[PDB]
Amino acid sequence: VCYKEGTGPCSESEEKACKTSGSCRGDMQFCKVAGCEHGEEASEAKCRCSL
């Protein structure tokens, strides 16, 4: 589940790209194999694809 932490979750078009992008941050195991790119978006990070 990709939730934005702002106004709840992030939109489908983002999360459709989020499954192909790594800029969308996430919790554990979304970066081990699902491949987060670990961007330094300290201000307004992308929607968190989590468990």
How many whole angstroms separate alpha carbon 36 and alpha carbon 21? 8
Resolved by: cryo-EM
The continuous run of DSSP H or E covering 18 comes out as: helix 12-18
How many whole angstroms separate alpha carbon 6 and alpha carbon 43? 12
Report phi then psi at 2, rounded to 5: -105, 105
Q: What's the Rg (C-alpha) of the chain?
A: 10
